[PDB]
A paper describes a structure:
SARS-CoV-2 is a positive-strand RNA virus. Its replication is mediated by a multisubunit replication-and-transcription complex of viral nonstructural proteins (nsps). The core component of this complex is the catalytic subunit (nsp12) of an RNA-dependent RNA polymerase (RdRp). By itself, nsp12 has little activity and its functions require accessory factors, including nsp7 and nsp8 (14, 15), that increase RdRp template binding and processivity.
For the apo nsp12-nsp7-nsp8 complex, we vitrified the sample in the presence of the detergent DDM. Our structure, which differs from the SARS-CoV RdRp structure but is similar to the recent SARS-CoV-2 RdRp structure, reveals that nsp12 also contains an N-terminal β hairpin (residues 31 to 50) and an extended nidovirus RdRp-associated nucleotidyl-transferase domain (NiRAN; residues 115 to 250) with seven helices and three β strands. The closed conformation of nsp12 is further stabilized by the nsp7-nsp8 heterodimer, which is packed against the thumb-finger interface. These zinc ions likely function as conserved structural components in maintaining the integrity of the RdRp architecture.
Author numbering:
A (entry chain C): 2 to 64
B (entry chain A): 31 to 50, 84 to 100, 117 to 895, 911 to 929, 932
C (entry chain B): 78 to 191
D (entry chain D): 85 to 169, 176 to 189
Write the structure that this text describes.
């Protein structure tokens, strides 16, 4: 139940990069910070808790 | 009660820890002499050198006491864990630097003390033990009077042993201030001044007046490789007081049909002194291809047309900013293959509590990564090595490489592989190396090589970020050096490198495939009749970042000893100088700007793996030498190794010329009792455990101490492994494990990788595959070939990885004998020693 | 023959990059030393007409780029432009302690020699 | 394209309350404008249309979102003035930023 979290985080960050979030600096910085943070997660609750933040970064935009 | 001594009799010799006349009536006039009868301190200079040369935690009580007593730091400082590291808490350097002046003043006393003896006609040997930490001298025991004014001192062992801690404590710092004082402003050196030769000789006569051998401030005047190493070792120490802006390429204005260019016509190396080109034309016309290639490659044009830059992110010396805008590069997250993950979960993989998981990912980095990673060169410090010790080791290492053949080669007989590599800045603007190799003709290549035989051509290397899988968070940069360097280094080194990569059974196993029994043959070669053998392997922290400059020059000088009939000493010297400027301390194109490398090794250099192999062998030999010389001679019972230790010490600090017979004897001793298998920086050893338990060969603490005092890193027990039961193969070698299996009516050793890495590389791809269905199946066959041995592992889950993969190749073949790759046998025959 | 294309590119690069080369400080810094041989690490430090500072955080800016003019390389530089790490123009009034978290560091400060 | 359909398909499959409750809340139009703070109780601007089932969002000046509870201290709508709660005389966006 923890592999699919780290597995969908990858496509989350991929689509975020495809939405040209990388063009901004302070957005891409925290996006990659929390993505790499949950790629080292050893407790699934934290992985979901930061998956919330990345999904929010996806949903805060209207594109 | 124990104290460090440097003992040399006709019975016992060595630098190790032990227990416990009228001459003074002719030396009291000297101010350095301590008053006999008095007023002496506790520890001597021998204790300091021992504690800083043979260092391990837990038993470093004397080093801690010394620092506290001389007010370097308070008692409270040693309560924070992990102080002694050079990577974590680099501030320890500052603490060490507070010993610096106490180590400089002492040197002054020495130059005074000997001056008394030569005035009093006294012959004898000065040892670190007879000197106090305040600098005074005593223990007039082995001195013999002679005619006054003709006294001669011996300071070979003293200076040689003390050399490693001269740069660690930065003792010559006070030579950078005015009037040589610690409370006065810095010397305002001229900015156009670069020679410093007279200052170098003044420093020599001020500190090392009685050093018998001659010192060449410019190593172009040197006689042989040994003299080059000597004078370069001295230049390393003397270059740390001169302004950092006075090094790098030297430039001059030429005219080409009127228009003036600024070109490189020399180079000021901190190790090799000042070097001046020999084919210089101040007036030219209609530059041909060679001059264009050289003139667009040197940093002369770029640092002069570019803007001044002050980069506060790093501490590396910055030169210029080639573009108005500053570039920030980001690396994207890795693409994910959904088909394979669905196939794996449909087969029962990635369940809770499993042994195999996902731990290898394409980590993503922000725009501040390249400069953050490049700032890791702060771990490369100027290190001065013991000269006698290193001069013996460079003779021992060449025995390990006396099996291959070398020689400079022509341009036509050059084999090029994967010509699509970054040709460096500014050559990657108009294509890859393939274009340049098809444009230049053969005589153009030969003329360029001859040019580098007589001139120095500094180049610019570009640092990029790599798109690669890993289990760590780091950035994994890539350095691409200029093709004007690769062409000549290939022409210089290819014949030796191909010989190193074609012989089997030697200590260096570079270029040997693990298929067809290769792993088994290599292992059995490692065993090779060692008595009571154990296995052991170690790790190099920050290997390509902290590797010193003396060791890199020594590695180049060892790899260049094969050129005894194809080029002269000056030609060999200009080749060495070209290499140091081109790949050791050249200018890096990071972002859109240029910085300078304080040293280290270029990962993108075709002569890298072999140079690290030489450095690994050198560290091993140094470890055995310091283990054999730090042993109490009395407690050794064997009558052979005690004479070996005696003649070892006599050949290091008492004999000048190389004694070949001892070189062969000590090489044979190492081969018999300490066998090695060396790949670029991963090493395995099979060692006689009974000898290593009493200090006759190198343990792991000897490697720990050697790395501490010579490589400016700290090696911990976490990544170093030992093996007492030989039936299991080595714990770790080149990201592979080894297991003993029964096939073909006998036992063999097979290598198997971590299944987590294989699964990770199967799930995540480099995006250079998702478009095509043939590269994907080729990649899956590659990981199936790497994963086949897992079938023989006791664990069933490990064995099922191969079955998953094979069914996946089967499905991809369906969706679209020895040639067919979908049946398992094709992978079985990959590991049978019959055959590619 | 692509050798012609590459050599033409090299010649064009060299010629175009010679235009911005001679600032007349080069000739009075080269003839000021015997043999006309100077280190390359001093030509941009005493000849370039423009300066670039890459400021990672505020505490460095408050110590380096005080006001509209600062002292560096034993010379005086006037701040010509400040640009954040998105190639967006920034005014010197925004750079304060309280506003600093809103700023997208690092900042490239382009200055002129005067 | 071809990635959102490969993203939300998995997103439904993780079956996490903190995720589905965000998607359906953002489905009809109640999306945030910044990131939700894991720690330090930072502000989060959440825009809600004109009475987009406000009862399912706030209860007694207490915000529920992402299966988490937020205490409201300041509300500003499109009129840039704090409005108290008749219903039709409002604007479309209502920022109920909370710490
Ligand atoms: Zn010499
Ligand atoms: Zn040669």
């Amino acid at each position: 139940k923890m592999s699919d979290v780290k597995c969908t985080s990858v496509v989350l960050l991929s689509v975020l990069q495809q939405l040209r979030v990388e063009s901004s600096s302070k957005l891409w910085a925290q996006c990659v910070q929390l993505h790499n943070d949950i790629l080292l997660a050893k407790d699934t609750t934290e992985a979901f808790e930061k998956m919330v933040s990345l999904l929010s970064v996806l949903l805060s935009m209207q594109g | 009660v124990y104290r460090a001594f440097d003992i040399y009799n006709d019975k016992v010799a060595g630098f190790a820890k032990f227990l416990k006349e009228t001459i003074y009536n002719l030396l009291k006039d000297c101010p350095a002499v301590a008053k006999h009868d008095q007023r002496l301190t506790k520890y001597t200079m021998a204790d300091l050198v021992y504690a800083l040369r043979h260092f391990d935690e837990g038993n470093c009580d004397t080093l801690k006491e010394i620092l506290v007593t001389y007010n370097c730091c308070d008692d409270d400082y040693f309560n924070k864990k992990d102080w002694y590291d050079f990577v974590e808490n680099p501030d320890i350097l500052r603490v060490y630097a507070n010993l610096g002046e106490r180590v400089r003043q002492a040197l002054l006393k020495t130059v005074q003390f000997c001056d008394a003896m030569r005035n009093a006609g006294i012959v004898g040997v000065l040892t670190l033990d007879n000197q106090d930490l305040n600098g005074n001298w005593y223990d007039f025991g082995d001195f013999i009077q002679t005619t006054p004014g003709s006294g001669v001192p011996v300071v070979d062992s003293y200076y040689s042993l003390l050399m490693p801690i001269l740069t660690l404590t930065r003792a010559l710092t006070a030579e950078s201030h005015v009037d040589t004082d610690l409370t006065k402003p810095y010397i305002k050196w001229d900015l156009l001044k670069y020679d410093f030769t007279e200052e170098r000789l003044k420093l020599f006569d001020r500190y090392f007046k009685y050093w018998d051998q001659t010192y060449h401030p410019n190593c172009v005047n040197c006689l042989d490789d040994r003299c080059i190493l000597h004078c370069a070792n001295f230049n390393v120490l003397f270059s740390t007081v001169f302004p950092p802006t006075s090094f790098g390429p030297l430039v001059r204005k030429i005219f080409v049909d009127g228009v003036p260019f600024v070109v490189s016509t020399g180079y000021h190396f901190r190790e090799l002194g000042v070097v001046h080109n020999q084919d210089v034309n101040l007036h030219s016309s209609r530059l041909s291809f060679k001059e264009l290639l050289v003139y667009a490659a040197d940093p002369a044009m770029h640092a002069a047309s570019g803007n001044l830059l002050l980069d506060k992110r790093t501490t590396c010396f910055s030169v210029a900013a080639l573009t108005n805008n500053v570039a920030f590069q980001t690396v994207k997250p890795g693409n994910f293959n959904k088909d394979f993950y669905d196939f794996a979960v449909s087969k029962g993989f990635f369940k809770e509590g499993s042994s195999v998981e996902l731990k290898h990912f394409f980590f993503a980095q922000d725009g501040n990564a390249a400069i953050s990673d490049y700032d890791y060169y702060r771990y490369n410090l100027p290190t001065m090595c013991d000269i006698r010790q290193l001069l013996f080791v460079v003779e021992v290492v060449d025995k390990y490489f006396d099996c291959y053949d070398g020689g400079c080669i022509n341009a036509n007989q050059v084999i090029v592989n994967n010509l699509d590599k970054s040709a460096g800045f500014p050559f990657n603007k108009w294509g890859k190396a393939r274009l340049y190799y098809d444009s230049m003709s053969y005589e153009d290549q030969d003329a360029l090589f001859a040019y580098t035989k007589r001139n120095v051509i500094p180049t610019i290397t570009q640092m990029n970020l790599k798109y690669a899988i890993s289990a760590k968070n780091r950035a994994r940069t890539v350095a691409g050096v200029s093709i004007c360097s690769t062409m000549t280094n290939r022409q210089f080194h290819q014949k030796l490198l191909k010989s190193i990569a074609a012989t089997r059974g030697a200590t260096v196993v570079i270029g040997t495939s693990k298929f067809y029994g290769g792993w088994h043959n290599m292992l059995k070669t490692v065993y090779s009749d060692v008595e009571n053998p154990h296995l052991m392997g170690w790790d190099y922290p920050k290997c390509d970042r902290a590797m010193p400059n003396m060791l890199r020059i020594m590695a180049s000088l060892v790899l260049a000893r094969k050129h005894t009939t194809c080029c002269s000493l000056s030609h060999r010297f200009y080749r060495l100088a070209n290499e140091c400027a081109q790949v050791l301390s050249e200018m890096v194109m990071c972002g859109g700007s240029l910085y300078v490398k304080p040293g280290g090794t270029s990962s993108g250099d075709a002569t890298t793996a072999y140079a690290n192999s030489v450095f690994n062998i050198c560290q091993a030999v140094t470890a055995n030498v310091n283990a054999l010389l730090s042993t109490d001679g009395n407690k050794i019972a064997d009558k052979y190794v005690r004479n070996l230790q005696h003649r070892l010490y006599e050949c290091l600090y008492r004999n000048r010329d190389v004694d070949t017979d001892f070189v062969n004897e000590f090489y044979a001793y190492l081969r018999k009792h300490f066998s090695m298998m060396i790949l670029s920086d991963d090493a395995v050893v099979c060692f006689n455990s009974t000898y290593a338990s009493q200090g006759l060969v190198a343990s792991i603490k000897n490697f720990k101490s050697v790395l501490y005092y010579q490589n400016n890193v700290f090696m911990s027990e976490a990544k170093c492994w030992t093996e007492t039961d030989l039936t299991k193969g080595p714990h770790e070698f080149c990201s592979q494990h080894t297991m003993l299996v029964k096939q073909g009516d006998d036992y063999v050793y097979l290598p198997y990788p971590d299944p987590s890495r294989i699964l990770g590389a199967g799930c995540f791809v480099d995006d250079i595959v998702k478009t095509d269905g043939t590269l994907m199946i080729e990649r899956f066959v590659s990981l199936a070939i790497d994963a086949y041995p897992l079938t023989k592992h006791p664990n069933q889950e490990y064995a099922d990885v191969f079955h998953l993969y094979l069914q996946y190749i089967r499905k991809l073949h369906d969706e679209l004998n020895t040639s067919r790759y979908w049946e398992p046998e094709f992978y079985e025959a990959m590991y049978t020693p019959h055959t590619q | 023959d692509k050798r012609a294309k590459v050599t033409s590119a090299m010649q064009t690069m060299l010629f175009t990059m010679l235009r911005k080369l001679d600032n007349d400080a080069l000739n009075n810094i080269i003839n000021n030393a015997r043999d006309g041989c100077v280190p390359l690490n001093i030509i941009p430090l005493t000849t370039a007409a423009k300066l670039m500072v890459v400021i990672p955080d505020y505490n460095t800016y408050k110590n380096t780029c005080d006001g509209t003019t600062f002292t560096y390389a034993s010379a005086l530089w006037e701040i010509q432009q400040v640009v954040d790490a998105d190639s967006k123009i920034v005014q010197l009034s925004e750079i304060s302690m309280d506003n600093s978290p809103n700023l997208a560091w690092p900042l490239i400060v382009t200055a002129l020699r005067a």
